[PDB]
């Protein structure tokens, strides 16, 4: 009956942003002021909804999306932003109704010599639609010559590694991000506070 937010926020490992994870939250009582009230977060921005307000409402579903990005990119996880993350990795809609939460995860996701397991999509012909998730790894053709699945000049693997090392500047350090979005169609309302 209690929403499994700890499953999301306290997960041992987080997804790369291009392959962002979505948790569906249903048939539970939430309570987000206990979640919000937590000096443990560097970002906690809500759009539409106010936080102390969410304890009052009933949505028919809630999604918790989560992933890791660089400190400098957290600002792209907002309605109306552009840049490599918003354009080609994770895109919020202009009329987004939800909250974006982020915290510095340098003490978890960095390694001496660089942790290279977290990736972002660098190359993509078109912008993602909101809440679109592109996990293709096709070689990206930047020129006129077909790649035939082989990397080379003008034929680039589309995903690139972050290099998370502990002494990086804060803008280059990993941040774990959770996006909560609130779903109200017309049916049962299975998630309340």
């Amino acid at each position, epitope marked *: 009956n209690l929403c499994p937010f700890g499953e999301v926020f306290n997960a041992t490992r987080f997804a790369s942003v291009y392959a962002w994870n979505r948790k569906r939250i249903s048939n539970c009582v939430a309570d987000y002021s206990v979640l919000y009230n937590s000096a443990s977060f560097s970002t906690f921005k809500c759009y539409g909804v106010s936080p102390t307000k969410l304890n009052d409402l009933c949505f028919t579903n809630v999604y918790a999306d989560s992933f890791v990005i660089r400190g400098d990119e957290v600002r792209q996880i907002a309605p109306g932003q552009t840049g490599k993350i918003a354009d080609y990795n994770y895109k919020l809609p202009d009329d987004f109704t939800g909250c974006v939460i982020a915290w510095n995860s340098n003490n978890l996701d960095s390694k001496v010599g660089g942790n290279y397991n977290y990736l972002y999509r660098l190359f993509r012909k078109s*912008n993602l639609k909101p809440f679109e998730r592109d996990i293709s790894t096709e070689i990206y053709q930047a020129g006129s010559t077909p790649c035939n699945g082989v990397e080379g000049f*003008n034929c680039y693997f589309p995903l690139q590694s972050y290099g998370f090392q502990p002494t*990086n500047g804060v803008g280059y350090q990993p941040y774990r991000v959770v996006v909560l979005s609130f779903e109200l169609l017309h049916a049962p309302a299975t998630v309340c506070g």
Partner: antibody
């Protein structure tokens, strides 16, 4: 052969407008990060603008609101539209293809000289 | 925003010697986001190194990149007359997305 050929630079009065062109061969402009970089006489390099394959654009503070980067897919050409030109915009303007962590700025056009003077 | 400060401003060395060019960043950046260029007079810049250490197409082994954080170095072994140029460093990880150093001008003695 792969290359970037620039044109459009020349003399323009302060307050006037010029459009620079960058015709590409090989590279598909609309599939790349494409940039403009300028170099005033005797000075260093200054990044000016970038356009993403998905169409996002960004600008240096020194040109924001006056310059517009754009492209024409059918001509495979990159443009820079410069308005309200000032004396300090006088420079050689380069277009170039950017690969970011996959290779930085690996190909540059030859440069076209813009002179802002009355 | 980030500033890249190159030193020395000017350098003059004999053929066969080794030039050491420094690039210092005002804040720590990941080495994945630093590159070096060579610009000879009348020409566009030529990419030498990207990602601090990776050699671009056509860059011979006598050009070597190193560094991390706030301190990067370009080394040019076995200098020759055609190495006369201005050398620039460049970051592409921090706001506004592209910044260049002010350049080191290399003269080749004879």
């Amino acid at each position: 052969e792969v290359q970037l050929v620039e044109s459009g630079g020349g003399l323009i009065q302060p307050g006037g407008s010029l459009r620079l062109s960058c015709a590409a061969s090989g590279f598909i402009v609309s599939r790349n990060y494409m940039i403009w970089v300028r170099q005033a006489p005797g000075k260093g390099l200054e990044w000016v603008s970038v356009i993403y394959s998905g169409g996002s654009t960004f600008y240096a503070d020194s040109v924001k609101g006056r310059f517009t980067i754009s492209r024409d897919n059918s001509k495979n050409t990159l443009y820079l539209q410069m308005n309200s030109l000032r004396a300090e915009d006088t420079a050689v303007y380069y277009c170039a293809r950017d690969l970011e962590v996959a290779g930085a700025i690996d190909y540059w056009g030859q440069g076209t000289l813009v002179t802002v003077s009355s | 925003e980030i500033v890249l400060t190159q030193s020395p401003g000017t350098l003059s060395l004999s053929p066969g010697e080794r030039a050491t060019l420094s690039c210092r960043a005002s804040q720590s950046i990941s080495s994945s986001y630093l590159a070096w260029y060579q610009q000879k007079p009348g020409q566009a810049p030529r990419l030498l190194i990207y990602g601090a250490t990776s050699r671009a197409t056509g860059t011979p082994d006598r050009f070597s990149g190193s560094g991390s954080g706030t301190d990067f170095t370009l080394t040019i072994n076995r200098l020759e007359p055609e190495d006369f140029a201005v050398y620039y460093c460049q970051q592409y990880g921090s706001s506004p997305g592209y910044t260049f150093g002010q350049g080191t001008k290399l003269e080749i003695k004879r």
